[PDB]
């Protein structure tokens, strides 16, 4: 959900292989729950610069 | 919702006509729902000073 | 809820007598609703350095 804190907007982003850690499980669904690499250790800030 | 992060409390606050942009729809309800004028472009800070 | 903003994690913290205010009422449940002593007036910080 964006700046307007009332509604959400689903997007898509494509990571790479070495940028995700996935939770293994017996889930048969075609969707694989999977977090980011290091978002449970410390908040990571972008490099929104040149 | 207040500082105590629970048990929200309804308020009122009346604006002027030059401070709202309201979506137009076919809704018949007596309540017109809409947002601020520039709250979907950047956060606006109060001027809590003299 | 913790840093992974998708799930909850219950803890227990054992406070002291002089650091809690509890709601008074006709409730019969064995659980007593209480808040921190001074979190409805300001945000409190931790004496985080040594």
């Amino acid at each position, epitope marked *: 959900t964006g700046l307007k804190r*009332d509604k959400t907007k689903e997007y898509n982003e494509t990571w790479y292989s070495a940028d995700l850690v996935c939770e293994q499980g017996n889930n048969t669904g075609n969707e694989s729950r999977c977090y980011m690499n290091h978002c449970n250790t410390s908040v990571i800030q972008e490099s929104c610069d040149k | 919702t207040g500082l105590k*992060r629970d048990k929200t409390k309804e308020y009122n606050e009346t604006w002027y006509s030059a401070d709202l942009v309201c979506e137009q729809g076919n809704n018949t309800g007596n309540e017109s729902r809409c947002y601020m004028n520039h709250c979907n472009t950047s956060v606006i800070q109060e001027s809590c000073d003299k | 809820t913790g840093l992974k*903003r998708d799930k909850t994690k219950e803890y227990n913290e054992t406070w002291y007598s002089a650091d809690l205010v509890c709601e008074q009422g006709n409730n019969t449940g064995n659980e007593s609703r209480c808040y921190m002593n001074h979190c409805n007036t300001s945000v409190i910080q931790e004496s985080c350095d040594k």
Partner: antibody, heavy 140, light 111 residues
Framework: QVQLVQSGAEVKKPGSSVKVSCKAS????????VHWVRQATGQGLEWMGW????????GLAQKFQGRVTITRDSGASTVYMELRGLTADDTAIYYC?????????????????????????????????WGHGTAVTVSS | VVITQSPLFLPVTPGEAASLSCKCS???????????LAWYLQRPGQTPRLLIH???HRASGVPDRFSGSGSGTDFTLKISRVESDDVGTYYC?????????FGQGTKVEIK
């Protein structure tokens, strides 16, 4: 092609209560919603209530508000619908039927502290399998 | 919230087309764009059979002659080449707000 089995017809005095029992082959109720419909001879169909297959949102109709109670056995093996305050107008054939729902989000307040505030509402779309029905006669 | 079904009584000559109307106007405060409406046919001595769901999609096994159309408040059900098998009462089921209700129904016979 799920099969629904309902209890036999009953005859009751005015002002008493009836408790119907409904079952689905293969415990289909554990994955599909449950509903209840009635109709009087020569009259239109009348809706009664429902209950989510997850068992979260349970309610009744405005007409029978407080007059009916819907309950199921653990595991959704059986579903029981109980009605009280019977009268002559209550004489109807009571039907047990399955279905599903479209649980969508109706509100959202991104709570920066703690979890997010979500509100969900259930809207009835699917009505696939109908039960044979139970005939109830309110008479002395 | 009420439902108006017209006409009450619709004699149809065999091989002719038929039109049924189920109108709802109390869509207070909205929620989902596609208001849920479901059409069912109850033949004598038979359980009601689903015909249309979401007001535009045919149900499984329904012949193409049964078509449901409409959006917003006014909806219509169109039947082509009516036959004896189509004799019965057509019910339109609101699927918007809790509690939900049946439609008063429209009676169709062979003229």
């Amino acid at each position: 092609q799920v099969q629904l089995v309902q209890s036999g017809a009953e005859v009751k005095k005015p002002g008493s209560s009836v408790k119907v029992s409904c079952k689905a082959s293969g415990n289909s109720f554990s994955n599909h919603d449950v509903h209840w419909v009635r109709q009087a001879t020569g009259q239109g169909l009348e809706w009664m209530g429902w209950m989510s297959h997850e068992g979260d949102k349970t309610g009744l109709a405005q007409k029978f508000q407080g007059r009916v109670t819907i309950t199921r056995d653990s595991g959704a093996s059986t579903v029981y619908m109980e009605l009280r305050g019977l009268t002559a107008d209550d004489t109807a054939i009571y039907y047990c039927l399955t279905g599903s729902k479209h649980r969508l989000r109706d509100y959202f307040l991104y709570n920066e502290y703690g979890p997010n505030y979500e509100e969900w509402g259930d809207y009835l779309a699917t009505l696939d399998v109908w039960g044979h029905g139970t005939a109830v006669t309110v008479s002395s | 919230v009420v439902i108006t079904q017209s006409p009450l009584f619709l004699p149809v000559t065999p091989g002719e087309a038929a039109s049924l109307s189920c109108k709802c106007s109390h869509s207070l405060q909205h929620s989902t764009g596609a208001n849920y409406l479901a059409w069912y046919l109850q033949r004598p001595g038979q359980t009601p059979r689903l015909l249309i769901h979401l007001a535009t999609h045919r149900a499984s096994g329904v012949p193409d002659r049964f078509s449901g159309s409409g959006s917003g408040t006014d909806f219509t059900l169109k039947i082509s080449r009516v036959e004896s098998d189509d004799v019965g009462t057509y019910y339109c089921m609101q699927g918007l707000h809790s509690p939900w209700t049946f439609g008063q129904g429209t009676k169709v016979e062979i003229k």
